[PDB]
Each structure stands twice: as structure tokens, then as C-alpha cells.
Amino acid sequence: VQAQDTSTLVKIPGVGKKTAERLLVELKDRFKAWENVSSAEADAVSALIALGFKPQEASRAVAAVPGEDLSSEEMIRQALKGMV
Amino acid sequence: MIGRLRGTLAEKQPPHLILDVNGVGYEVEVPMTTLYRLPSVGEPVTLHTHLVVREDAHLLYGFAEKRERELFRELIRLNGVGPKLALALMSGLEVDELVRCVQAQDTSTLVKIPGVGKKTAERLLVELKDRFKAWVSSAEADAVSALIALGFKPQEASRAVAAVPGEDLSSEEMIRQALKGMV
Amino acid sequence: VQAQDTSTLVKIPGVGKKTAERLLVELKDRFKAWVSSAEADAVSALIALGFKPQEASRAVAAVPGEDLSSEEMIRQALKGMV
Amino acid sequence: RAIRPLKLADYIGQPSVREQMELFIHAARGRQEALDHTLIFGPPGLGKTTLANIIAQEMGVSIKSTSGPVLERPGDLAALLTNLEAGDVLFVDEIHRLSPIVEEVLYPAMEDFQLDIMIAARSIKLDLPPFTLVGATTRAGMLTNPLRDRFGIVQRLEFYNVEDLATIVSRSAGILGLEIEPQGAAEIAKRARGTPRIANRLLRRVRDFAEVRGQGDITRVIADKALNLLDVDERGFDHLDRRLLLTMIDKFDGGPVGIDNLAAALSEERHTIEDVLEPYLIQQGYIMRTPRGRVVTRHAYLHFGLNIP
Amino acid sequence: RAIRPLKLADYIGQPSVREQMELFIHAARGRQEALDHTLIFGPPGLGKTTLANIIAQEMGVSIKSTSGPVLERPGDLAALLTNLEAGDVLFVDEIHRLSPIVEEVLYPAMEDFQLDIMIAARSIKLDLPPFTLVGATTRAGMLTNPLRDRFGIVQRLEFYNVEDLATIVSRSAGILGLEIEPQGAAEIAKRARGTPRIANRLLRRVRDFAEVRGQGDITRVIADKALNLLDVDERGFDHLDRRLLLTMIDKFDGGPVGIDNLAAALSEERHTIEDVLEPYLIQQGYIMRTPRGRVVTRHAYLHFGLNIP
Amino acid sequence: RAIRPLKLADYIGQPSVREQMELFIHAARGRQEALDHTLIFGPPGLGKTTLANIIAQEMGVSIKSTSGPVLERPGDLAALLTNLEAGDVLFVDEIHRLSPIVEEVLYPAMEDFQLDIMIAARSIKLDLPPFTLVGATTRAGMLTNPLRDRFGIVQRLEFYNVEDLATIVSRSAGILGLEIEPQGAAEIAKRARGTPRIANRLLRRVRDFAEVRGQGDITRVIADKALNLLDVDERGFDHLDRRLLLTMIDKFDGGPVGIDNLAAALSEERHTIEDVLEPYLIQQGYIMRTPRGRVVTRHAYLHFGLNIP
DNA sequence: ATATTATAATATATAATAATAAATATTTAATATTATAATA
């Protein structure tokens, strides 16, 4: 869960995908610390979706380094450097 | 039960509204967004509605749109969502913008809604992710069959066929206009 | 219900054999007062010939040979897909 | 808007062969019954589909155009047979490839238009309406001998001579409203492999040449400088033809190697290479066939002014 | 910054073919009609889309550069044709890989610019504006006979003439700024390998050689010093090719060979050999191919003084 | 000086490789010109990625070698493109083992250093700084030929001769701080089955085993003990290989027999035999399988000294 | 006259998607309280 892999959860019989993100989300919801947009940004997000990016990694990359009053090619470039 | 009301407005005490439909008023609330679309006192109004039955109470909820009723109902079917939460959400933001944010699964635009925790935001986004759908004449059927033979899906073909050209046009020109589209 | 038929009820979607058979069991006491051989032969011949099983049955059932021979209804069924 | 010859007398070439099909035409008109099943063998460019549709027009019957490469399943064959009616005809090209099951299905379908295949359970007894299956393969040697024996009409389609191809050029120019000089018609008639399709394509190229480089109709000099711009000799050479001739007179020293090797060297498909090569090169007798390969004659090697060692 | 002539006259490399297609362009311009269908085949990678774009600017109209994956569904090509207009043109690629349903849709599309489609069968007839359908494939041998016979213009693309390859080398070196020699141009033309891209790569590498070994000067001696060691030869051989030839002739003495045995013995998998080295040598014809083993021809024996069995 | 040395003088490779291309790029760098794409390939485990890292180390340009099978995704490809800047170099391992989407998002970068990105939606024009792909594949035979045409420079790797292997062993033992005699260096080179980096690994293992039984100095008795424990003699024959060849000489006396017959005789799987056992002997003159069967030299028999005419 | 094996097709183990039926799980609404960030 602290590694956030659903594959280890779903091989257990009776455990599907939806149960796996429920376990992940609702345990990361504070129990497991202890051991027991603009046109340019929308264009960028759509380009990332068309280039294999799932929307969450296309979302928090935009959120971390937003682009302001300048053209798309450079903040998408530094965002691609940003996600590394 | 209750699916829609077409009645006359009696009084406005937001958010609680009373709708006198043929002598009897109906206790219904509407969101503040719908407060920006209500008529004056005494004017008739048609509200798409859907009831909620509790153990000790019956609550009536009425919206301007049927699709708003359906989204409200699906929000209520969620295990951690009450009516107060859904009214807070839709009083913050409107319907298709929330739909696209559900496609986005972003918490920033929904945390700003008052009284909403971040944990609520991610759990609702994850359990509301897109499993739903995104929001004939002789010439019509001929075009549908022609584009089926051309490989286009019947539902995909029909929306391009029936949109731009008019009613009962020449089959060649209307097939031309249906195939005018690109993705 | 009077004829104690199950497969008629089973073909309804969402109906299991146990569900329909139970419906028989309680309805026989609840109620107190209140296509041919050539049709399947054409389908089998088209399947063995090379035709896809469901579109062949679609052609067979579009214009069945209820009042005419199996060869002629196959002849007019091959009109559909040309 | 089609140039296509819709007349029997348009294909007046091979007068004995045309008169033979005329006798068969009047026999069909006189029989008013089921014809013998037709299988014509001949190299392409001569309009075998044109011949079949002319046969249909003279019969006063509707024709469907299909081919052996098109068909893959006996169910498709049954569909094609059902779409045809009484007083119809089917044009089929390249029967040389066929599934055997299609052949035993067609055996009663051309015996008495019958179908008696297995479903066990009830077998089919479908009797087809009277319509003649017309075969238009290129070579009957590769196809099965029982089918060739069972087909009634068999004929040799050959490349057309100079006067017929010149007449076809003149009448096709008359269709387009242009005129051809008899000498230019004769030279492009003895050229273009003696085939009306290639002759018409060459006519289109030369008429475009006269549309731009010329200032009027095509004469002998217009056609000559057209072939000069087309880089075509008096025999009807192509650049690929010259290159292949040079390879098999120079690289392989007579070319006693298989057609597969030279086709792979040229990166050319086997069927296209042989269809381009064999009829015109054999009627000129430049190259024969050996099991070692398609070796040249002495005359072909002397054509380029080279003496045989 | 790709290498591309701006105009069709500026296009150099196939002067007779360039004159022929210029004649076709002026025929389209003078007649005020859409140009005929042009069939294009030859080398696989030559930037044919760019040449089609040049033809588009010569027409002044738009050409939608489309390929097999673009037109694998008949709906996409139907939509593109509906957005096509009078006097326009459509570049088509990978026609050989395309489904026969595409072929039957494109039968009436070029057949006088119509469209027939089926809907208990009902027929729906559609019309199309006149246009110039452009069919270009890596290999045209897979094109079906009625389709190719119904087409009009057929154009062949090939590697340039050796003097014309040398001129192309000179022009590209002038573009690259290399101080090249006509003797060096003929040298690289002999090294052009039938491919413009590898030719330009060789120009770049001999420019590097002249920069680092000479004083920025490309001469015949400089070109010889650059291209007479390692995987080079005046004809086009490599030391890889010489190694392959020697290892075949010392083992099997110019006899039948096992391809797996060759791959094992050369420490080199047969796949890359038959992908680059073997196809060029068989393109030169220097290896004769059998279903029992690949043997070099008499040219390689003459290269090393070897006998003929 | 490391486990793999990073100096061009510290790696005694093939003399053509030792001379040409790194000297070329050493004398060509500093011209403010982006280096073109270079390929290295050969037997596996020869440190082609390490050699590319070495080359980029003398080039003094930021470099990080990434494995292609690890990087299946074009998004990480865009990440590596944006991580580097103008005039940089990048090394890719096993390009032939990439998902194709990487390839068509990589072609315009080879064309005009352009990253065409798809999002009526329209593509966006995203230019890239000048950069270089260095290729290091085990076998890129199934890679697409236009991608080869975009690539400029390719070098092979071959079975190194005994002198180069001995020099490599000597320099790597000097790196290891060994006291091996030149006779011991030749013994280690002959015990190693060529493969200079795998030869380095084998020398490391021999050094560790000798240090287990003594000091860093290696004597011919130490080499004999290493051959005995590894069950591989100076000829490089595996113990399984030695047993199989002893059975073959004890059964058919080296006569040409079938591969299936000997596979059934030895009770071993034939495909593994083909891809493991005979390759090592067959780069050299040992095994000569024919259309009649396998033939073995008497030099292989010199291990035991029994041969037949 | 026997194999053999150098090239030519081939058929399915292993990727995938699409119902489906047994097996479950079955509560939020209102309100103090306490931090908590921001504030005269």
C-alpha cells in the first residue's frame, strides 16, 4: 500500500481492481504511517492523453509547474523535464 | 414516485422552496445555481424532480434539468455521499464542468467548495470515474446503411447523419454532408 | 404454467432454470381458476457450407420457408447478403 | 461516360475465332436452353471482360462481373448463383485457383444446375435457374483437367494483328472525337503488344502529347516524337523491358536461369513479369523456355548488335 | 532541412521520366480537367509524399497525403473524398495492403467519379466530383489486374543514372557546402548504392574526411582515400560482402549452401544479411538464387579468378 | 582502470575499429556540428553500450545509456529527448526491441529533429534541439529499413583473433593488478571463446579461482587447473561438447549424418544443440555440415589425435 | 534409393475482450467540540 501497486492485491481470489483502489485510497487516508485550465494547458493535457499519459500524471505535472502568459512549447518542455 | 413537477411558485425562502401544484404546496429545495434560474413569486415553473425516502423523513429535490436529477441520484447511490454533500458540490460548480473534472480526477477545483475535505474529493472522484457515457427517414436509413457498409458504427454514423442536413433531403448531398466531418 | 414448461421461461434474459422451475412450483398452486424441421435444416446446411452461424440464421428467419420448400427458402435467403 | 465497345463487330480481330463465337451466339439464340459451360483462355489486354459483356449484350441478358481470386468460399459461390436469375450470365476470371469443395459443388451446378451436398440430416436439393457460367482464364494449363474437360466452350484468345489494332485505334479516336494517321495507327497497332487495352492507353498518352507538345491531331511525326518522349522503340520497348533484356543478354550471358531468379533480381512479381514478357517476346521468338531457365535466342542477342559466342 | 527540389523541372534524376510527367502536368493544365490516375512504384523509401506535394503546388490544389492505415476503413476514405473537391487530388499509399472492400469502393470513385452502395436489398447511388486519384506503392505487383488495367497513367521510379547520380551528388554537396570534385561526384555516384539517402550520408562522411584528413578539399584522391578502406568498393561491395563471398566459396566452392549453416559459420545472423547485403547483390544479380542454396554468379568468379562448374 | 576501462587507448579492439571512427570524431569534434547517428552491433555481451559510453566520454558530452526493453514507452522517449540539449549524444540499447509507437514518434526526429505530437483536433509542431542517437544492438536485423536509411554509421563486431584476445587479457589483468605471464595470458585467451568482454569476465573468474588456490600470478599449472575445474580445454570445447564429439567420432567417424539422427543418438534437444554447441566450433574451421550431413576437420580430432582419411 | 535439408507454407499457446452467476454487505443526519487560520 505504501508502494501503491494494485497488482499484488488483485491476484488474491475475490479481489478485483475496484476493491484494490478502495484499499489503497482508504488506507492511505491516514491509517498507515506506523507499522502494524487555459487553452495551452488543455492542449498540453490532450497531447499527453494522446501520447500515453494517464490523466493524473498529466494533471499534477500541470499543477506543479503551471504556465503563465507564454507559449505552450516551453512549459510543456520543462514539464516533461519536470516529471522525470 | 416523483419524477417531475410542472407547477406554480408560491414563495421563495432560499434554499427552501414551496411549489403550489393545484392547491397544495410542495416542500422542495433547489441549489443556489438554480436560485439563479428561478422565476418570480406566482410564476409557473417546470422542475425535474426526484424524491429521497429516509427512515423518518421524505425529502423532495427538484432541479431545472433531468440530467441534473440523474447525476444527483448517482451521487446519492454512492456510499459516502449525502444530499448535503451533493448540494454543496453543485452549488460550487455546474454539471458538465464537474463531469470534465471527474474525467480530470482533480481535487484542486473541488476542495475550494466549502465544507469539503480532500479525502472526500479523491474518494468521490475515484468511485465516480468514467464508467457512464460521456455527456428514421428513407434518406436517414439509407445513409446509416451506407456508412455501416463503409465501416462506420450505426450510432457513430447516425449522429453525423441527422445533425447537419435537414429533413428529407437528397440522399447524395446528405451523405456528403454526413461524411464532411473529421476527428 | 399449465403445461409445466421451463425452456420457454429460461430464454428470457436473467432467468435461470431454477428460477423458472420454482415459478412453476408455486404457480401450479397459485392458479386455481383464472419454424419447422427445414428451418433448422437450412441453418445446419448453411453452417456446414461455410456461413457464419448467426447471420445464416438471420437470413433463414428473415424469409422462412413456412409455406415453401427448404431449397427455395435458402434461395431467397441468399438474396439478403447478395 | 465510357469509351467501351458495346458492339460485337468492334472486336473484329481474330476473324475465325470471332466467327466461332458468332456461331455459338446464334446457337444460343436458337437453342433457348442451357448452354455448355464456357472457359475462354487468353492473355490479358484483349478485353476478355469486354468480350463477356458483349456476349451478354448479344444474349440480351444481365451479366455480373466476378473472378476466381474474388471468391474464397462455396457459400459465396451459392450467393453469386442465387443473385443470378433465369436469362442471366456470370463472368468469372482466373478459375485456375479454386477450392476443391467449390469444384464438387459446381459439378452438379453445371451438370443440371443441381446442388446435392451434405447438410446425416436432410441434404440440399437446390436446382439453379438456367444461366451459363462463362470462364475467362488466361491459361487453361494450370487449372484442373477435369474442369477443362467438363467446360464446353474453349477458345484461344490471341494478340490482335496490326490492321485490327489500327482499326480499333481509329474507332476509339472517333469515340473521343480525335483522328489518327493510318501510318501512326499502324505503328502503334503493331506496337502496344497487339492488345486493345494497351493500345487505348498508348492512345491516351499520345493524345496528351499532341495536346501539349503537338498543336493538333496525331500524325506519323506526332506519334514518332511522342514515342521519342515516351522512350519507346519501333517494337514497343519499355525501360524495364530494356533493362531486363540487357540483364539476360549481358549479366547471365544468355540468361539460362529461372524466371524466379531474374524476377527477384528485378524485385518483380512473377505473374506481372510473365504477363508482360511471354506473349510479345514469344510471338517475336526472341526467348524460349528451358528447365534451366528462360534462355534467349541468337536473334535477340543480335538485336542489340552483339554476336553470339 | 531535407533535400528536396522545388519544381518538377528542378527535380533532377529521371530526365526522361521527368519530361513525361511534365507532359502529363501540362496536359492536366491545358485541358482544364483533373489529371488521370498515376501509378507510382519503385524504391520503398524515396519521400514520395513530398513529390506529391510538389505536384500539388504545380496544380495549385491540395493533395491529402494518405496511406494504408489511413484508408484501411472505407468510411475514412469516403469522408476524405467527400471533403475532396473538383480539381483536387488524393495521395494513396499501401494500396496493396488495403482490403478488397476499399478496392470495390474505389471502383466507381475513379470510374467516371461515382459511388454505388447497398443498403431485401436496396441500391443507393452516389456521385463524386472529378479529381486525380494518386496510387503509389512500394511494389505494384500486388495490384489486381482489372484495377490496374482500368487505370490510366503508370509511372516508374528508379535509382538515377550514374552520370545523373553524379550530378545529384554535386548538387547535394553544393547544398551541404562541400568543395566537391566532378571526379569525386562520379566516385560517389558509383557508391550511390541505388539509394539517395545513403548517397547523401556518403557525401556527409567524405565531407568529414576532407575536414579532418585534408584541408576541406574533396578530390578524386581524397574520395579514394575516404572510400577505399573497410566496407567500401568502387562497385558497391563491402568487406562484409567480401567476407561473405570468401566464406561461401572456401566452404562449398560455389555450390548449394545452408542458410542456417551460413549464419552459424559467419558469426552473423542470416536475417540482416538477407535484409541489406543479399538484396543489393541480387539487385546487381551477382548472386543467383535457388530453393536449395544461394550461389554467386560468374561475375564474382571473374572478380577472384574462379572456375565455372 | 575500472571493471570496464573508459579509455579508447585502454581497449585494444579490432584494428579497423581501433583506427577509423573514434579518430574521425576526435578530429571532427569542436566544429559546432551535431554528430550523426552511429551503430555498433555483434555478439552479445561485448559491451556495445559500454563502448558507446566510452566514446561519449571522450566526446565530453552529457550521456546516459538506457535500455530499450526497459523504456517501452514514447513518453519516456520524450523525457529523454527533453532531458538533453542542443548538440548532445544519446546511447540506446536494443533498438530492435522497441514497441513500434516509439519508432513512428522517432522518425520525424531523425527527419528534421521534429517531435510531431498529436492531441477538429490538430497536431502540434514541437521542435527539438540537435541531438544524436548511438545504437548498440545485439541484432537489429528486424529493424525497419527506412530507420537504417536515417542512420549513418554502422560497425560490426567479430570473433577476435588470438593476438587481440591475448592483448586484451594482458591489459585487463594489468587493470586487475595480476602477475600473469604472457604464456598464461595466451592460455586465458584461448580458453576464452573469443568475446572480449566475456573474455574479461572469464579472466576475472580465473583470477578469483587462482587467488582461491594461490596468489595473483598464473602459471601453466594454474591454467591447467582452471581448465579442469571449468571442464573446458584450451581449444574451448565444452565438456558436453567434448562428450558429444567423442560420441560422434566413436559412431560415424565424422561421416555426413543427419542432425536428427545424432540428436536422437545423444538424447539431447536438437535446437539447443544448433544454437549452442556447434556455433563456437563453426566460426572457426571445425564443423562443415553439408547437404549430406556434418563434416568435422581433423584439427578438432587433434584434441585426442585420432583421425580417419 | 535414401535421406536431407534449404527454403515454402502452417495451427495454436498465449496475449486479449464479453456475459454471468454465486456471493455478499447492506447508515448516514445533525451537532458539539476542538483546533486553527486569520483578525481589532
Residue numbers in the entry:
A (entry chain A): 102 to 137, 154 to 201
B (entry chain F): 1 to 135, 154 to 201
C (entry chain H): 102 to 135, 154 to 201
D (entry chain O), E (entry chain P), F (entry chain M): 22 to 140, 145 to 334
Paper text:
Holliday junction (HJ) is a four-way structured DNA intermediate in homologous recombination. In bacteria, the HJ-specific binding protein RuvA and the motor protein RuvB together form the RuvAB complex to catalyze HJ branch migration. During homologous recombination, the RuvB hexameric motors are attached to the RuvA-HJ core complex through the interactions with RuvA domain IIIs (RuvAD3) and thereby drive HJ branch migration and strand exchange between the two homologous DNAs (Iype et al., 1994; Iype et al., 1995; Adams and West, 1996; Wald et al., 2022). Here, we describe the cryo-Electron Microscopy (cryo-EM) structure of the RuvAB-HJ intermediate complex from P. aeruginosa.
The complex contains eight RuvA subunits, eight RuvB subunits and one HJ molecule. The eight RuvA subunits form two tetramers sandwiching HJ at the junction center as previously described (Roe et al., 1998; Wald et al., 2022). The eight RuvB subunits constitute two open-rings encircling two opposite HJ arms, with each subunit binding to a RuvAD3. As a result, a cryo-EM map of the PaRuvAB-HJ intermediate complex was obtained at an overall resolution of ~ 6.0 Å, and the local resolutions for the PaRuvA-HJ core and PaRuvB-HJ arms were estimated to be ~ 3.0 Å and 7.0 Å, respectively. The resulting PaRuvA-HJ and PaRuvB-dsDNA structures were subsequently used to composite the model of PaRuvAB-HJ tripartite complex. Owing to the resolution limits of current optimization methods, the final model only shows single RuvB motor, although the particles selected for map reconstruction clearly showed two RuvB motors within a single complex. Moreover, because RuvAB catalyzes HJ branch migration in a non-sequence-specific manner, and the density for the nucleobases is the averaging result of all four possibilities, no sequence was assigned to HJ DNA in the structures. In the current structure, however, all the eight PaRuvAD3 spring out from the junction center and each individually captures a PaRuvB subunit. As a result, the HJ DNA molecule can be perfectly docked onto RuvA without steric hindrance. Based on these structures and our intermediate structure of RuvAB-HJ complex, we propose that RuvB motor may initially be loaded as four-subunit open ring, with each subunit attaching to a single RuvAD3 from the RuvA octamer core, then the gap between the two ends of the open ring could be filled by another two RuvB subunits (seam subunits).
